[PDB]
Design goal:
The structure is cut from a larger assembly and holds eight protein chains of eight kinds.
Chain A (H helix, E strand, L loop, with lengths): L10 E5 L5 E6 L2 E3 L2 E4 L5 E3 L5 E6 L1 H22 L6 H14 L7 E8 L5 E6 L5 E4 L1 E5 L2 H13 L21 H18 L6 E8 L2 E8 L4
Antiparallel strand pairs in A: 1-2, 1-10, 2-11, 3-4, 5-6, 6-7, 7-8, 8-9, 11-12
Helix pairs in contact in A: 1-2, 3-4
Chain B lengths: L3 H4 L2 E7 L2 E7 L1 E2 L7 E2 L4 E4 L2 E7 L1 H21 L6 H14 L7 E8 L6 E6 L5 E3 L3 E5 L2 H11 L6 H17 L8 E6 L4 E6 L5
Antiparallel strand pairs in B: 1-2, 1-10, 2-11, 3-4, 5-6, 6-7, 7-8, 8-9, 11-12
Chain D lengths: L13 H12 L3 E5 L4 E7 L21 E7 L1 H22 L5 H14 L11 E7 L6 E5 L10 E4 L3 H14 L6 H16 L8 E7 L8 E4 L2 H13 L2
Antiparallel strand pairs in D: 1-2, 1-6, 2-7, 3-4, 4-5, 7-8
Helix pairs in contact in D: 2-3, 4-5, 5-6
Classes of the chains: A alpha+beta (222), B alpha+beta (204), C alpha+beta (233), D alpha+beta (240), E alpha+beta (222), F alpha+beta (196), G alpha+beta (238), H alpha+beta (198).
The complex binds magnesium ion (MG) (7 copies).
Subcellular location (chain C): Cytoplasm; Nucleus
Family (chain C): Belongs to the peptidase T1B family.
Keywords (chain C): Cytoplasm, Nucleus, Proteasome
């Protein structure tokens, strides 16, 4: 019989900074026990200060992004280049995604940007459509190795104020972008060390109220 | 996984010197559980007779479908449907649905109002015609019927005797078939007059 | 759904300072059989592109037809068809990919692994995979099915990264790529000895170097092997 | 007389005549079957100085071996070409071998045919000249609104067809063995100039293409460049 | 199911038994596996009964319509081609194998079609379960140019072969004959080897043995 | 099943057995496996019975129709016609089919449209249940083009050994001579090839 | 006007249709041999710029059936095609090659259907089909635009019908048979040209004419050269 | 399966039908009426596949009511049940059959007599003195064969039925949460709501 699906590893990540947003995800690409390309970008700018990435099965992935980047374009044509509020984009994707409900896109997709107030915002997607406003989500193979960590580091989960006995949980505080990227790189290295499908390089798209920035940092070619 | 064998029932017919006969049991029930003992597998369209075994709804649906068509025939042709003719029809009809077959076992029999010749036929669920000059059997205990009929059929019986033979043929085969019984009924078709009779049998 | 009948084995490729290369033996297998000793697995399109196909020949021949038939189609009402406006490698592939996908999305694909190579009018190198599943990726090195497990290794000793292409001489590329071709024949039942290599250099152009043999092999040492453990004499 | 389908009291379809009437009214086109292959030429009419030269091509190729041109209603022409383009490429996919010019015409004739059968449609408003090669030589035909076409030694329609006609007449006799591939072009170049003398107050731009196993190599190429120039000058001398 | 056909110097003959099974049971002791397509073209068919009949009925039906319209006469291959074009259009789903045979204004003809669309030709063909016994008989007693008598004698003695050594077949013999100038004779039961012997006892019952609970005189017309 | 077609100096000739088997039994040990589509264009059917039969019928139709308007068609022009049929339906078709035809100009051509639909112009091709043992002979004992009678032997012995080791293929031999001359209908009875 | 009954039931579009068949301006005649058949048609090539190869009013429908048509070339090429394919489809669907008389039936049938349902204007051409089938031998049937065919022992279509006709008729009241007594086609051919020349008060060169012959299953168009040689033949013998 | 009973008596009909609703493990509602009055004197209890059930009933209901105001004349139990059977007959060979069994109780006003029709999802109809779809018959049919008399009063029937229930409780594995009982007669429909305190 014919098997129409496949897995190309990959791990992506989205954190909603107070007034920014990051969408990072490595550059490796796999099949079975082989390599395909040391460098292959999974994170993209789609205009309107909005980043996207869909990890799972490449083909279904890039097709969604392509199918989307077009649906953005067409939004401008019919509404006089009105900007797409991130919230809007997602409701839109839901549909796209749900269009293929009974033959889904075999992928976990994520987007990030800014709301109509300047607050950072991330959005995690189901492989068929359920979307959530997340402030932090790791998806991909390594997922279960990073999520536990951010849990702790980003939300200080299970961390209390010393000498309070265990009656005062350590208060959250919002970290500058620098601070976030430090976390992020560490997360990936740790992950590469203990996960075969992960390594090589890391490409990060940072969204802010004046564009998209890209920074790269090399991982281990384990 | 057989449909025909779900509801139960049998039907048999024979040709006598100048007449015919056709009888069936009365039982109707989903596998083990017996449900009715007033369910008849024999009806007619004017002077033509049809016995149908097999799957219950399909039986009913067929009767309706045939009553329907014969009414419409007799109307435009100002004359009732003839036996031989009916056969060829019910035949085609079964086939039109050759890929969603009706799970049944019909048997037609009557007397042609022109030649005056006795008639009997049997078919498989798709319309294959079994022309016979002695007897026709269809239903659960098909095999038990052939055992009776083969011994008892005698070319050209007197209507009063033919009745006794067919009655016994049906009646006895029915007891070695677990899925048929609960009463029976036999008709005797003469040129003119026709006699319907219910008989007494084991009710187990 | 379907199943592959006749099978083309591997197709290896890599980039260098000026352009790119792509080789692929001339064998079309019928299972374990070799019913076809000399068959073309390299369709050059235009003169700045070539396409190394690996999989089903029946399917591969269909594509060929799509290319020639697409090519003849670019001409139609457009004078600049041999210079300004004319098929770039990036195009074909884009169209090719498009197709392979619709196909899998229609539950009936083309059993193929494909490499598109050439050079952009503006001088850039192009090398990209695309298989029956509609999947793709760029890389300094690329090999189909059987290639990638065995060829890619060596090809990565010449170019571990993108930062080595500038210093990758057209000759160093070749010989290495052929050593690879010798190896593919050393340990792969589906492979042939005759083959076809092609180069697309931004200076020289296309150089379809059809039909060659794989020479220089160490076999002599065979004589020294006896038994499997004890069998001495 | 007003509908397309109908016949006149003595069997006549008027809409088709007017179709013809419009074909004449437009520019003039020609074509010539020579040694091996053919040569075509048309009359682009520069109505102003704001027209980019070497630009709006009226001649079109089909497959990779069939020249083709016409005159009358320009969009009608373009339309017809498309159908011809499918038919060709479909055939090709089917029989593998590039389409025989002989049949090609019919495929088109049959399509132009139809538009004379129903009233809901409009007759094709163009006369069309074309040709190409194959195995058994080069051919050249000319299709009219009626759908009736044939094979000619050279053809002509649009405004001044006679000019080129009597002009084509001569060639026949002095070169009753097919004119030289080369000379064919330069000769065509002239035959146009001569026939243009109606739009004389208005300047123009001549376009030329050709086919030949020796010159084009089985293909259809646009006569542009160097051969193109001299072919003009050649005409320019006899232009006195 | 056991049938054959053999053409002689001036025609062709097909024969088939008269028994129709049903698993291990005998449904009809007298059935006619020989059907008329047209006056001169007839068939014999095995496998699925209802299929074989209805199909010839269909074809016979059309071929009549044809000849009429054409004002000419039924060609044998016309029938053949009709059969196998429809027959295969339903990739096997219509079990019907048969020996088609007749005579047209150009010769005597004989063919065999399988249930999938396969058609063959020889001088003698056998189809059915006992196709082997009746095959073996014809493969030892056959010589080119046999006569109305030689051929006939054979065909019937081939059928006989199956009737005896093969279970799925029995009772009497059916035969039909087409001669290159003459008519066609349908000989229902040219033979009658199997006949039940007179029974031992007389099983007629003495009137009034069966118990009756009710009785009446049912209605018929208006 | 056992077929093939070979080209030479006067053109090409194709030959095959007569044996067709349903299971381990012989349905019709006298099959005309060689089939005519056009006067100078024929073919030898391999694999499925019912399928191969019908394909031809269709093709025969296309060509006999092609001619009536586009003149007489090539041998390549014919192969492509099978390409389509074979391809499109690869899922409900079993066909090994070998095609051959001659034209004075390009001599006689040989094309094989094996299962799947892949087409091939070879010097000569061989398909069918028992082709498997003549990969040794054929290739090795093959001189570039021969004579009418000279060639008739390749056919003769290739075919002979195939019967000797493959029961699913047997019966008599039958050849079809396609030349400038025309068509010649051959037939080589048993006691002959076995002797060799 | 339009396609639906007149007050005397004669819908003229069908009638008008006829003049146009004729209007072309060419004369077509046909006669039976004994083991062959023949048709004569004129080949008037005006424009000295055309090519006589490309001209003709006779085409090879089948391996054995040919067709001539006195009528406008565009409409003819159509009829030509459909018919050409009906036979193609026939042989396939029925096992044996389609005869003259029949094609002419679906053909007339077809032209009737059009006419009655209004799915198009009738073609303004009269088709004259020829061949020899091994059921009725030398066959000749003709069809008109008013969807209708019938049989001729020898016929004619043209601006001057009855003239070509009457001759043959008179030649027939005497020869008394219903065809041409003679074994060779060359000879029959000769005969017709003869009966036409005589019938026009006109003479023809080796290109001014057009003729076809239907044999024992091998129909072929008469070409430029062979055509002349019959004029040689019938020059002295006259 | 669920519980669906029905019994025809003197000048009326009685329909029993369990109340519970189950989703694999837990029991959602347990006071659920598996009934649907089609017309003033016709009524239909049902049991079957989860969704198939409630949809079909209402749908049948719709058609009837429609017919009944259109004509202004009411339709006979006999004919009603004929149509239901029609619909299921098709349903069974549809791309997706409504898997549902039913009992139809009505009072034929012209005959002034009560009729009761049992019909399975295959499209199998039969006029009966009493019935029960599914496993429900096995446990009870006997007691009915035993004590049933055509002449029984409306009350007589209840007692009987009541006894059948007590049994179903005693030997049935499943907890059906009791029963809702209803009567169709020359007066129309009313509910023996009292079967909780009774
Ligand atoms: Mg918005
Ligand atoms: Mg590693
Ligand atoms: Mg039975
Ligand atoms: Mg019993
Ligand atoms: Mg109209
Ligand atoms: Mg036996
Ligand atoms: Mg053998």
């Amino acid at each position: 019989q014919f098997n129409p699906y496949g897995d190309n590893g990959g791990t992506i990540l989205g954190i909603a900074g107070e007034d920014f947003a990051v969408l990072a995800g490595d550059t490796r690409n796999i099949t079975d026990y082989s390599i395909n390309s040391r460098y292959e970008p999974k994170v993209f700018d789609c205009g309107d200060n909005i980043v996207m990435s869909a990890n799972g099965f490449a083909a279904d992935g890039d097709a969604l992004v392509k199918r989307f980047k077009n649906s953005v374009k067409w939004y401008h044509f019919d509404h006089n280049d009105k900007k797409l509020s991130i919230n809007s984009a997602a409701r839109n994707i839901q549909h796209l995604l749900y269009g293929k409900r009974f033959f889904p896109y075999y992928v976990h997709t994520i987007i990030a940007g800014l709301d109509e107030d300047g607050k950072g915002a991330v959005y995690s997607f189901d492989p068929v459509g359920s979307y959530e406003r997340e402030q932090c989500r790791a998806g991909g193979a390594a997922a279960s190795l990073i999520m536990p960590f951010l849990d702790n580091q980003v939300n200080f989960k299970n961390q209390y104020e010393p000498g309070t006995n265990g009656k005062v949980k350590k208060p959250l505080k919002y970290l500058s972008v620098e601070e976030v990227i430090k976390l992020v790189r560490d997360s990936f290295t740790s992950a590469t060390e203990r996960h075969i499908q992960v390594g090589d390089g890391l490409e990060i798209l940072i969204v802010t109220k004046d564009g998209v920035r890209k920074e790269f940092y090399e991982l281990k070619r384990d | 996984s057989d449909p025909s064998s779900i509801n139960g029932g049998i039907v048999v017919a024979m040709t006598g010197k100048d007449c015919v006969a056709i009888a069936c049991d009365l039982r109707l029930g989903s596998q083990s559980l017996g449900v009715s003992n007033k369910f008849e597998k024999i009806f007619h369209y004017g002077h033509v007779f049809l016995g149908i075994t097999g799957l219950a709804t399909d039986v009913t649906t067929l009767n309706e479908m045939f009553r329907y068509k014969t009414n419409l025939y007799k109307l435009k042709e100002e004359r009732a449907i003839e036996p031989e003719t009916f056969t060829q029809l019910v035949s085609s009809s079964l086939y039109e649905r050759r890929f969603g077959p009706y799970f049944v076992g019909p048997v037609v029999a009557g007397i042609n109002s022109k030649s005056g010749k006795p008639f009997i036929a049997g078919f498989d669920l798709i319309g294959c015609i079994d022309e016979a000059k002695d007897f026709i059997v269809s239903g659960t205990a098909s095999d038990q019927l052939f055992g009776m009929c083969e011994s008892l059929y005698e070319p050209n019986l007197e209507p009063e005797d033919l009745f006794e033979t067919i009655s016994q043929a049906l009646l006895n085969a029915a007891d070695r078939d677990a899925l048929s019984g609960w009463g029976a009924v036999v008709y005797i078709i003469k040129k003119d007059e026709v006699v319907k009779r219910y008989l007494k049998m084991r009710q187990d | 759904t379907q199943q592959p009948i006749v099978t083309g084995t591997s197709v290896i490729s890599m980039k260098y300072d000026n352009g790119v290369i792509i080789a692929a033996d001339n064998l079309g297998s019928y299972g374990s059989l070799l019913r076809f000793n000399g068959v073309e697995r390299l369709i050059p399109v235009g003169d700045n592109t070539v396409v190394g196909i690996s999989g089903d020949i029946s399917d591969m021949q269909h594509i060929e037809r799509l290319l020639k038939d697409l090519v003849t189609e670019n001409a139609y009402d457009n004078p600049l068809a041999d210079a300004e406006e004319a098929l770039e490698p990036s195009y074909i592939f884009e169209y090719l990919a498009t197709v392979m996908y619709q196909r899998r999305s229609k539950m009936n694909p083309l059993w193929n692994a494909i490499i598109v190579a050439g050079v952009q009018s503006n001088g850039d190198q192009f090398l990209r995979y695309v298989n029956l599943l509609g999947v793709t990726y760029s890389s300094p090195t690329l090999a189909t099915g059987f290639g990638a497990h065995m060829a890619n290794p060596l090809l990565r000793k010449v170019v571990d990264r993108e930062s080595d292409i500038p210093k990758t001489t057209v000759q160093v590329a070749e010989e290495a790529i052929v050593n690879a071709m010798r190896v593919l024949y050393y340990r792969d039942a589906r492979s042939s000895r005759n083959f076809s290599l092609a180069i697309i250099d931004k200076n020289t152009g296309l150089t379809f170097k059809k039909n060659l043999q794989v020479e220089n092999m160490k076999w002599d040492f065979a004589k020294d092997i006896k038994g499997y453990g004890t069998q001495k004499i | 007389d007003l509908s397309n389908s109908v016949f006149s009291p003595d069997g006549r379809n008027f809409q088709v005549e007017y179709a013809v009437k419009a074909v004449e009214n437009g520019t003039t086109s020609i074509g010539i079957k020579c040694n091996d292959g053919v040569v075509f030429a048309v009359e682009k009419l520069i109505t102003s100085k704001l027209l980019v030269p070497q630009k709006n091509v009226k001649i079109q190729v089909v497959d990779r071996h069939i020249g083709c041109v016409y005159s009358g209603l320009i969009p009608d022409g373009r339309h017809l070409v498309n159908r011809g383009r499918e038919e060709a490429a479909s055939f090709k996919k089917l029989y593998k071998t590039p389409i025989p010019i002989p049949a090609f015409a019919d495929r088109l004739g049959q399509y132009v045919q139809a538009h004379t059968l129903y009233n809901s449609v409009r007759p094709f408003g163009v006369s069309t000249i074309f040709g190409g090669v194959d195995k058994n030589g080069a051919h050249l035909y000319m299709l009219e609104p009626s759908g009736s076409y044939w094979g000619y030694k050279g053809a002509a329609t649009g405004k001044g067809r006679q000019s080129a006609k009597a002009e084509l007449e001569k060639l026949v006799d002095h070169h009753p063995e097919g004119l030289s591939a080369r000379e064919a072009v330069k000769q065509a170049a002239k035959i146009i100039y001569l026939a243009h003398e109606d739009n004389k107050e208005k300047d123009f731009e001549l376009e030329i293409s050709w086919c030949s196993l020796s010159e084009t190599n089985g293909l259809h190429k646009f006569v542009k460049g160097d051969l193109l120039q001299e072919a003009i000058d050649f005409a320019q001398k006899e232009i006195n | 199911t056991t049938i054959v056909g053999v053409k002689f110097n001036n025609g062709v003959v097909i024969a088939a038994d008269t028994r129709s099974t049903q698993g291990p049971i005998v449904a009809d002791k007298n059935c006619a596996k020989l059907h008329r397509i047209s006056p001169k073209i007839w068939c014999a068919g095995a496998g699925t009964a209802a299929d074989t009949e209805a199909v010839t009925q269909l074809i016979g039906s059309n071929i009549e319509l044809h000849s009429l319209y054409t004002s000419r006469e039924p060609r044998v291959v016309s029938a053949l081609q009709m059969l196998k074009q429809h027959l295969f259009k339903y990739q096997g789903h219509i079990g019907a194998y048969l020996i088609v045979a007749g005579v047209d204004p150009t010769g005597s003809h004989l063919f065999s079609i399988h249930a999938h669309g396969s058609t063959d030709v020889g001088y003698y063909l056998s189809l059915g379960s006992g196709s082997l016994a009746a095959m073996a008989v014809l493969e030892s007693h056959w010589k080119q140019d046999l006569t109305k008598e030689e051929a006939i004698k054979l065909a019937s003695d081939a059928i006989q072969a199956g009737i005896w050594n093969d279970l799925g077949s029995g009772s009497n013999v059916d035969v039909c004959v087409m001669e290159i100038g003459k008519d066609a004779e349908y000989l229902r039961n040219y033979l009658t080897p199997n006949v039940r012997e007179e029974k031992q006892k007389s099983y007629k019952f003495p009137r009034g043995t069966t118990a009756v609970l009710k009785e009446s005189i049912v209605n018929i017309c208006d | 099943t056992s077929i093939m077609a070979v080209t030479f100096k006067d053109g090409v000739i194709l030959g095959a057995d007569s044996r067709t088997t349903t299971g381990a039994y012989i349905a019709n040990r006298v099959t005309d496996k060689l089939t005519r589509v056009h006067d100078k264009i024929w073919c030898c059917r391999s694999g499925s019975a019912a399928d191969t039969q019908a394909i031809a019928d269709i093709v025969q139709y296309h060509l006999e129709l092609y001619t009536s308007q586009y003149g007489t068609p090539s041998t390549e022009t014919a192969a492509s016609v099978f390409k389509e049929l074979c391809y499109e339906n690869k899922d409900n078709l079993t066909a090994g089919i070998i095609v051959a035809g001659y034209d004075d100009k390009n001599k006689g051509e040989v094309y094989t449209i094996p299962l799947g639909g892949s087409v091939h112009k070879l010097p000569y091709a061989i398909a069918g249940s028992g082709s498997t043992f003549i990969y040794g002979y054929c290739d090795k004992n093959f001189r570039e083009n021969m004579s009418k009678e000279e060639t008739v032997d390749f056919i003769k012995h290739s075919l002979s050994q195939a019967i000797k080791w493959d029961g699913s293929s047997g019966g008599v031999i039958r050849m079809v001579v396609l030349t400038a001359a025309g068509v010649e209908r051959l037939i080589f009875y048993p006691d002959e090839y076995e002797q060799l | 006007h339009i396609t639906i009954f007149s007050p005397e039931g004669r819908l003229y579009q069908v009638e008008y249709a006829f003049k146009a068949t004729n209007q072309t301006n060419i004369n077509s005649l046909a006669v039976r041999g004994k083991d062959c058949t023949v048709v004569i048609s004129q080949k008037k090539v005006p424009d000295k710029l055309l090519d006589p190869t490309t001209v003709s009013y006779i085409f090879c429908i089948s391996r054995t059936i040919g067709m001539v048509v006195n009528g406008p070339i565009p409409d003819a090429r159509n009829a030509a095609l459909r018919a050409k394919a009906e036979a193609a489809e026939f042989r396939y669907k029925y096992g044996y090659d389609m005869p003259c008389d029949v094609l002419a039936k679906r053909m007339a049938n077809l032209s009737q259907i059009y006419t009655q349902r209004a799915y198009m204007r009738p073609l303004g051409v009269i088709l004259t089909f020829v061949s020899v089938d091994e059921e009725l031998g030398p066959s000749i049937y003709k069809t008109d635009p008013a969807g209708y065919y019938v049989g001729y022992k020898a016929t004619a279509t043209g601006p001057k019908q009855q003239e070509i006709t009457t001759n043959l008729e008179n030649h027939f009241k005497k020869s008394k048979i219903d065809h041409i007594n003679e074994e060779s086609w060359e000879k029959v051919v000769e005969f017709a040209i003869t009966h036409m020349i005589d019938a026009l008060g006109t003479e023809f060169s080796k290109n001014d004419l057009e003729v076809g012959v239907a044999t024992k299953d091998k129909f072929f168009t008469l070409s430029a050269e062979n055509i002349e040689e019959r004029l040689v033949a019938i020059a002295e013998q006259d | 399966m669920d519980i669906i009973l029905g019994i025809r008596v003197q000048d009326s009909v009685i329909l029993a039908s369990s109340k519970a609703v189950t989703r694999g493990i837990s029991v959602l509602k347990d006071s659920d009426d598996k009934t649907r009055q089609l017309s003033p004197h016709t009524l239909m209890s049902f049991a079957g596949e989860a969704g198939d059930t409630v949809q079909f009933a209402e749908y049948i209901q719709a058609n009837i009511q429609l017919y009944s105001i259109r004509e202004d004349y009411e339709l006979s139990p006999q004919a009603v049940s004929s149509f239901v059977r029609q619909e299921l007959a098709k349903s069974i060979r549809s791309r997706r059959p409504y898997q549902v069994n039913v009992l139809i109780g009505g009072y034929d006003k012209k005959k002034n007599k009560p009729e009761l029709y049992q019909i399975d999802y295959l499209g199998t109809k039969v006029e009966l003195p009493y019935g029960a779809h599914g496993y429900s018959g096995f446990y009870t049919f006997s007691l009915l064969d035993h004590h049933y008399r055509p002449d029984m009063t409306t009350e007589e029937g209840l007692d009987l039925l009541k006894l059948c229930v007590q049994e179903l409780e005693k030997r049935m594995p499943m907890d059906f949460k009791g029963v809702i009982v209803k009567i169709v007669d020359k007066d129309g429909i009313r509910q023996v709501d009292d079967f909780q305190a009774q």
